[PDB]
Structure formats: structure tokens, C-alpha cells
A and B are shown apart, each in its own frame.
Chain A
């Protein structure tokens, strides 16, 4: 079919790249703005998340879809910074275009970026810091403020700081051959409206959204040794031989409930609704029935309370029974009204302890953004506790590393130093884009910040304390502030994997030479 080769394809690759790059430019930084997407189904979705946009984004260019899969891999590896990482592919491929039109060979561009990022780890070793960082009184709050970038939660992040920290405090467990980590992605988030952001409650346990059929049951259980059972089977009314089968099936249901009553389970979790036959057995046995449960939420209950889901009741023989090993354990069961509904609160579980988060917002479009923003912050603390090395935030990292690459280019020399200079100018778009979203001047703070880092490497003792060297930048007032007063920092694993995952991503665009379009059937 259509076959077109030459340098026009690489010029078209960056043209389609810069076209979709404008999507994440306005959403970068705490002051970034959201954008509305039309789903053509009558509704719309307003999101600044690059992972959600690139998924729905329609790209008619074959190479433009590579950036879509790049954000998907960064969600499992990192889980945050979607618009603060992928955005570099705009100018990085644009500066390489000037080298393609010149006599620079693509391998020099490829090997130039590899030697730059390989030796960049030693440059990062200067800005690293331990997990203790300052004198304390703020520990996981400083890393919780990392999610302020690219998101609008920075205004309400004051009260939400202690909510995220305390949610991951009691979920501690032992895994990874004895390593102590927090099993994230297991936190339940409930959507609610009313009051304000400061009224958000943190539940140190499991929260279930359902409706209790009979209010006369022991809704609130006082004391320990609470047994909870889980059954995937549906016990209800279901299909003169028709009346005889109805009586035989009713006896089978009452027999299976009798096995649960004999086990002493205080809470019975069912997938579907409960008929009137099972409700009469629960009141006499002082058991609270639960209906309309989601299978995905029941999987976390099996790990938390310790109640394994029962697919079917059977054994090696033809006897049906419910074993006692499928019962869960917790400290107490408390039921309170949460947002025009009564939810079950399971706290103090035996096997594993979980946590639930209740959020408040304006509308459903606001809660969708507030949920994913705080959900991505859970991975920020998780990835930070894995590697104690941390780097300061504020965009001062990209401006500082580009100065060391200037003398590093003179060390290597030859033709590989020109690609290093172009790679240093490519990283300068990150601090300049933040100035555009902050309605400030671009080169104003960039030229000044690089002046403090220019003499940073020239200081022999570090003369007295730090006259020039410092970290952090103030986007609101457009001034250079210290990282201690600003209180902003970012994890190292997020910054290293940023350019590391983008390494093979940008080169893949450069490796494209001949473009061929086959006509569809």
C-alpha cells in the first residue's frame, strides 16, 4: 500500500508527538488545569491524569500510541507522576530532530543518551538523602506532599496528610521473604458528599456498603471473639411436582444455614439478597445477615478477617457441610450511618489489618479526581520506604543535573558531547512548563537557579555554610526557596525510572525509518 520513507517520517513523528504533548503541558504542576474529554456517549470525563487521557486519546499516528503504553507500565512500576515524566518526550525528540537533519548518526544519539543516564546515577548520589531527612515532627507528611505536583489536592493536602499516613500505619505485615512492607491497592475508598474536606473520616479497618434487611438483628456486636463467615452461594427463593421441589430446595437452604448457625458466625456475607426463610433463622440465632456483596471486596475480606470464600459445600463424599476453618475473626463490629446509608465497620482483624478511607467532594466528577489523586499517593509512600534514598523537589533536579553534563561532555568529547548538550537542553522544559502554568516568566528562575548550582560544584568545603547551593523552588511567588522551608521532596525511584523508562521510549521513535500503511480489508 502506501509507502513513504526518508526524514519526513521522523519530522512527522515529532509533529504528532508535539500535538499530543500539549495535553500534559497545561496539567503539569500543582497549579495545572484539568481538561474535558467527550466520550460521544452523552457524558464527559474531566481528568488531568495522563494514564487516563492517553487511554481514551485517539491517535491516528502509529508511533503516537507508544506513549500510551509507556504510561501504563509506569502505573505498576511507579504509580504517580504521569504528566511529570512522559512530558519530556516532547522536547527530547524535538532536540534530536535537529541532529537528524545534520550529519549526526543515530547511533551517536542513542549511545549519547545511554552514557548520559548511566553516569547520571553518580550525579544523583550527591542529592540523595536518608529516610529520616530533617529533625522530624514531619516524617511521612513530607513525602505525602509529593502528590501535590500535577494534582490540585495541594490545597486540601493539609488535613489529608495525616489521613494517608495513618491509613498505611496499621496495614503493616510480613512478605517478600520477610520484608516489612505495606500491601497497598487494598485500601477501600467510599464516595460521599457533604460537609467539607476537614470532615473526612479515616476508618482503621474494613468498611462495607450494603443495606441490612432486618433492623432487629444484633447490628452492633460488643466484645471480642467475633466470627464472620463468607459464602459465595446464593440462598434465596429460586426454581404437583413444582411445589415438591420448592419444599425440597427450602430444606436444603435451611440445612446449609443450620451449619452456619452451629459454627457461631455473627456476620454472614451473601452475594445476593436474602429471602424471608433465612431471616427467621438469623433472628433466633442473633446473627446479622448481609446481602449484596461484591466478589472483589470479598477477596480482601478473606485475607483480612480470615474467612475463606466457599464456592460450594461438599467433600470427598456426598455429604454437605460447612467447616469451621472458613470463619473469620475481628475485635468488634460497629454499624453507623455514613452518607445516608449504614455501613458495617470491621476493625481489629486477626489475620491481616486493613484500612478504609471516606472522602467528601462537590460532585461525582470531583470525587473521581480526588480518589485517584490520593490513590496514587499511596504508591508514593510505598516506593519511598523501599529505597530510603530521596531527592528534593521543586524542579531543581533537572536544572542541577544539566550543569554536571556540561563538564561531562568535555570528558567524553568527540561527537558524543553534542548529544549530551542537546539532552541537557531537553530537560529544561520541565522548569519552564511550570512557569507557564504559574503565569510567571520562564528563563527568569531558570537562569537564576542554574547560577546557584553553577558554583555548587566549585565549592571546596561543600566557603561558609551554603552561600549558593540550595534546593527547592517556589512556583507561587516565583522565587528560590530552600527545601526545608518549602517542605517539598520527591522519591528517587520515581526520578530514576522516569528517564530510564523513557530511554527506550524516545529511541524507539528515532529507530523508526520507513513508514508503511496497509489498506484495511
Chain B
């Protein structure tokens, strides 16, 4: 009885995300105390800023935060399944059926579900689609399943070429970080092969900065340069500038800002320098240029100075930023977002970061199955025939989970404006007499084959979806009481 009151409060969680399922889904507006406007489809940022009342709401948050490691995308079609399993289980909990039979029967259904998902996943390899194909043709609609509907054609010819430079067995997520550049266009974004960061501070020689370097060398120094007492303070800073020139570093990255004495000495010799360097940008250079950070001038040596192919000063959005190109070791390609709207920059920021997860799991194993919610329909069709002979009461228990997967096609018809009953009758014959691969087609507004539609989705998303919804739904049934002090 105490769990039922906890479920009803958690039902409204995915019922607010109810329209968000599918590429036609909507977004949720969140305004915090700082008046920060956040518009995104991903529920991870939604549940993070969502006010929680009962501790059961935090359960879906912990799974959503861990969803980035397991899958990272399709969170609208996953978290909603955790509330649907407990929605249809209410009549069973009111009867003499214990929640243990629901939890024990759930693992028996997932064990049969994952067995069929691995059966649906087929790896041909051989002469079929290879690199630059599976990541383009089959990943066209797979990368972004929710947003970027109009700009999808732009990123397939751009973002796919950026993730192609990432070799298997490495999968570095530290070098894929993006930046926020106001103004410009989305399809006009320039590809960056090296470390690029903002200046964050204006110089008097901002227009006089060197345009480009033939053989630049980046050196990271934490020494703070700031100005009998006058002659002593000016001489000590001057001696530190001469020791840096001995190494022959054309680019010097300083953590703390520098005064006019260090700027004038570097400007006359055409030596580049940048202040207010963040600690996160220093680790990015170590994995790209391969230099080192020297705290003082005692241990500085010429071999600690790295180098890169060439340097270029880029001017975009009425502001100039540092641009590195031709780094010795680069596992990815830096992308710089553009556009005048801040929400759009943050909108595609969550989408592009979710697209790299597909490239990560594809390099390990290349597999595709029928998308568009047709995966649960074939699994639910097989569970109806098996559960009849499986352990007594488990027939009606698994059939409840079989009908719980029917929420996915009902949600796809809600946004598209279709009928929830009409799609079930057409798929029931399509997943029985129509074998398997026949899915639903939104473009032609009818039922068709996803094999000829070119739309596929990785089956690894559905594998971790049941595991992420396993401990999430089991924790609700395993907790029969909630106590809040004061």
C-alpha cells in the first residue's frame, strides 16, 4: 500500500516527458533561481534541475546520471519504461501477489529478452558496409533520434568526418569538448585539428598579435609576472624573461595574468603569450602538443618545450581565439559550435555529446537492428508464447511486462497524431506473419520495413535499458516504507 502512494508521485515524472519520445518530441523549460534558461530534450538535465519530493524520484536521477556511461542517448524511451512497469503492476500488488514474484519474474523476462536482442543483433562483417558507411548511411538517423531534424543533413556530412579520426581501443572523451561561439551558422562550423580556447581577456596589442607561425612552440609556465625597491622588482622580472627566451618558445601559456613588462618584451620579439589559462586547457595541451608545466624557472629545460605543425589566428564572431593545427598526437577533431542563440548552442551540445557514444560502441562491435520502437514489439510477441508454460502465475506476470512495452508505439502515435490501436493491429501481423524486421515509418505515415527505410538503431541501447531499469524498478518494490526525519 505504501508503494502505490510512491508510484503515483513518480508517474508524473515520465508523464511530463510523455510527448518527448521520438524525433517529434517536445522540450521542457526549466528556470532556476539564477534565471538560467535551459531548453533540452534530454531528461538528464531535466531530472538534475527537477525538484524532488519523495526519495523515489532520486532513483530515476541516479539511473539517468549513470545512463551516460551505459548508453548516453535515447533517455526519453528508457526512463519512461521504469514507470510503466509499476503502472500496470498496481492490480497485482493489491491482490495476494507479492512484489518478489514481480522482481523474480522480471529477471526471467529480461533473461529471455536479452537472449532475443542478441539474436536480433546480427554481425555479417565480410563484404557488407564498412567504415565511413555504417557511421554515415546507417548512422544518419541513429546519431540524433530526437532533435536536429532540419540540420541532420548538415551534420552527416560534417560531424561524421570529425569522429572518423577516432581510432578504436582509445575512445578519448577529454578531447571532444566543444566551445560556445556567439553568432554564425551551424553548417558553417570550421573543423579544428588542435587545442583551441578563448582569450577571455582583451589586450592593447590585440590587433597587433602575430598572425601565424611557421614552427610554433608552446610552453606552459605558472610563474606570476607582476611589478632600490623599483630597481629590484623590475630586474627580477626581467631576468625571468631572459631565461624563457633561452628555450626559444614562440608561445607561452601563463596561468596568472602578466603585466605590461612581460607584454612589451614579447611584442618586440614577436613572441606570443596568453594569460588566464585554465587548468583544464593545460591537460588538453599535454595530450596534444606533449609539453609540460613548469612551476618555476629552476627546473625549466629546453627539452620540455613541445612543438606543433603551424599556428593560426582565427577571427570569428567579432572576436579572435587561439587556434592550434597539426598537433603531434590528436585522437579526435575539435568542433566549434556557432549561432546567435545560446539555447541552440546548448541544444546541440547535449546531442553531439550523445552521438559519440554510438561511435564508441560501434568500434567494439558493429551491429544494427530495427529502430522506431519495433524492438520491444518483437520481444513482447515472443514472451506471450513462452510465458504460458513458465512457472505458474508467471504467465500473467510476464504478460503484464509484455503489455508494458506497448507504451512505446503508443507514444510515437501521440506526437505524430496517429491511432494507438491501429498501429498495434498492423504490427501484430507484421511481427508474426510478417516475420520481424517490419517497423513503423513516420515519413510515409504508415507501416513499412525499416530495412529499406535505412533507419536502424544499435541493439546495445536496449540491452543496457533493461539493466538500467532493473535495479530502478526493483528498488521501488524492495522498499515498503519511507521515513523522513523532521
Contact = CB atoms under 8 A, between A and B. Distances in A.
Contact of A447 (B96, B396, B420, B421): B396
B388 interface: yes
B300 to A, nearest CB: 73
Given A432-B95, A454-B388, A444 B393 contact: yes
B392 A447 contact: yes
A413 interface: yes
Interface in A382-421: 413-415, 417-418
B314 interface: no
Contacts of B169: none
A443 interface: yes
Contacts of B425: 413-414, 417
B96 A441 contact: yes
A442 interface: yes
A443 B95 contact: yes
A441 B95 CA distance: 9
Chain B interface size band reads 10 to 19
A289 B180 CA distance: 116
Nearest to B395: A447
A444 B393 CA distance: 6
A84 interface: no
A451 interface: yes
Contacts of B96: 441-443
B267 interface: no
Contacts of A418: 421
Given A432-B95, A451-B388, A454-B388, A443 B421 contact: no
A210 to B, nearest CB: 56
B393 A414 contact: no
Contact of A414 (B97, B388, B396, B421): B421
B95 A442 contact: yes
A137 interface: no
Contacts of A441: 96
Nearest to A440: B96
A448 B392 CA distance: 7
Contacts of B395: 447
Contacts of B420: 103
A418 B422 CA distance: 11
Contacts of B97: 442-443
Contacts of A413: 425
Interface in A428-463: 432, 441-444, 447-448, 451, 454
Nearest to A451: B388
Given A103-B420, A418-B421, A443 B388 contact: no
Interface in B302-321: none
Contacts of B95: 432, 442-443
A418 B421 CA distance: 8
A504 B416 CA distance: 37
B83 to A, nearest CB: 16
Nearest to B95: A442
Interface in A503-518: none
Contacts of A432: 95
Interface in B96-134: 96-97
A119 B304 CA distance: 90
Nearest to B97: A443
Interface in A175-214: none
A415 B421 CA distance: 6
Nearest to B91: A425
Contacts of B393: 443-444, 447
Interface in A447-499: 447-448, 451, 454
A151 B395 CA distance: 33
A156 B183 CA distance: 92
Interface string B361-388: 0000000000000000000000000001
Interface in A95-110: 103
B133 to A, nearest CB: 42
Contacts of A103: 420
Contacts of A417: 421, 425
Contacts of B396: 443, 447
Interface string B417-436: 00111000100000000000
Interface of A: 103, 413-415, 417-418, 432, 441-444, 447-448, 451, 454
Given A441-B96, A442-B95, A451-B388, 7 more contacts: A418-B421, A443-B97, A443-B396, A444-B393, A447-B393, A447-B396, A448-B392
6 contacts: A417-B425, A418-B421, A441-B96, A443-B96, A444-B392, A451-B388
Shortest Cβ-Cβ A-B pairs, 5 listed: A442-B95, A443-B393, A415-B421, A441-B96, A447-B393
